[PDB]
Design a binder for this molecule. Structure first.
Ligand SMILES: CSc1nccnn1
Ligand SMILES: [Mn+2]
Ligand SMILES: [Mn+2]
Lengths: 137, 137
């Protein structure tokens, strides 16, 4: 059967600024780059940045809610979010509707998130403060 | 410091067919559902389906190369691809890289992939046959 996420591939319009964002600003590990892409890891996540002439820099009001959240500890969350803020990283959401999260945009407008907590913890929180109509299996 | 992918959230135009696709066709575990979304797991992956009226059913020619690859064993790959084909799931790309890959679309046109092989495997293959301009770190 399917066993998890093998890799996340993001189309990027300019490779070097995107590599710098994920490696320098977000602290991900850069393993290789070539004329048309790069391979990074974030813990167990395999991230591929793929230079795509079709990728547009997309304002957050023009894209849907599809987004990618990265795990961070409770101890590191606030200072990492504040550092992104001080660095001028654009945002896309302010209301914490799914726990402790910071919502920010990559250079092409990919919707990203820092989040503290697992699925199990989110389900436990939702049992006390459920979303409308919520059923647990 | 970021420790991995926390969750992947896909905006969906209709919740019921998306739940059917990820739970029933793809075999993911459904943990909770509410009026405007669902939480599923696939191995370590926490997947959120978020009902979003802004989600367009998007032809693959009209979206960039951003995509989400799920892990499957070599032994299971061909029968899973055949299951998707029997269900009439559209393919958006043929495989031309190392490791088995099947490139398929979800009901809203999200670009998905079944892939066999890790980042370490890909890096080893690239070391032997580097892409144009490839540098390792
Ligand atoms: C070589 S381009 C690519 N590489 C890995 C994953 N997705 N795309
Ligand atoms: Mn999220
Ligand atoms: Mn891929």
């Amino acid at each position: 059967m399917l066993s998890g996420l093998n890799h996340l591939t993001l189309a990027v319009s300019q490779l070097a600024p995107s590599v710098a964002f994920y490696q320098q600003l977000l602290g991900m590990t850069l393993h290789a780059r070539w004329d048309s892409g790069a391979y990074l890891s974030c813990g167990d996540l395999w991230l591929c940045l793929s230079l795509d002439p079709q990728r547009r820099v997309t304002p957050p009001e023009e894209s849907d809610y599809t987004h990618y959240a990265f795990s961070i500890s409770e101890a590191d969350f606030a200072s990492f979010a504040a550092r992104l803020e001080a660095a001028g990283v654009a945002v896309w959401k302010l209301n914490r509707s799914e726990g402790a999260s910071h919502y920010f945009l990559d250079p092409d407008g990919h919707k990203l998130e820092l989040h503290v907590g697992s699925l199990a913890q989110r389900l436990a929180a939702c049992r006390e403060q459920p979303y409308k109509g919520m059923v647990f299996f």
